[PDB]
Structure 1
């Protein structure tokens, strides 16, 4: 039996840790909602 607990407001915070890249990926989506890479 699952329960929810609050964790924060939903707000944009100026000067947050900027990171990660922007990869363009060819992908497929099966009927079970699994993304896969098409190569």
Structure 2
């Protein structure tokens, strides 16, 4: 039994926590949908 339940509206929130960095990465995407790093 896979089922869904509403959890909220899709909205931007002005007072959201802010975190995370912004890496620039070379990647490849294979037939299975898997990303891998490339050098």
Give the TM bin, normalised by the shorter chain: over 0.9
TM-score, L = length of structure 1: 0.92
Q: How many residues align?
A: 39
Structure 1 residues not aligned, in runs of 5+ = none
Dislocated runs of 4+, deviation >2 Å: none
TM-score, L = length of structure 2: 0.92
Q: CA deviation at 1:27?
A: 0.1
Q: Please name the residue that 1:34 is paired with.
A: 34
Q: CA deviation at 1:15?
A: 1.7
Question: How well do the aligned residues superpose, as a CA RMSD in angstroms?
Answer: 0.7
Structure 2 residues not aligned, in runs of 5+ = none
Structure 1 or 2: more strand by fraction:
2
